[PDB]
Amino acid sequence: APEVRCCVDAVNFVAESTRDQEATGEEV
Amino acid sequence: LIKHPEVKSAIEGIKYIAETMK
Amino acid sequence: KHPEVKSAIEGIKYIAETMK
Amino acid sequence: QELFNELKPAVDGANFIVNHMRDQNNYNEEKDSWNRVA
């Protein structure tokens, strides 16, 4: 179902945003 | 799962989180 | 058991460990 | 359906997380409105 696709994409987007915040925080 | 309102609310919630942080 | 679902699971785990 | 009964705490937690995020965003929006008034 498309639900699986978009929910997985949203969760992955949140994970990558967290990773970017950690990398930015490591540079600071 | 499809008929349950809580699962749909949770799905739309994760969509809301993703869009708001974007 | 697609790679994307496992990636999402690992992302949830990463969020939990980050807050830990 | 043991699967849904076992996943129900996860659904409740996700809904709680969503409600927390929505309330926080509304709070921040009202703070922004006060900033614009200032």
Added chain:
Amino acid sequence: LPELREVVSSISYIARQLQEQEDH
């Protein structure tokens, strides 16, 4: 299903942390 159990544990931990933040 260790993956789903780990996901449930992570979600429950996240909710617990946010509830602790709410009380604080």
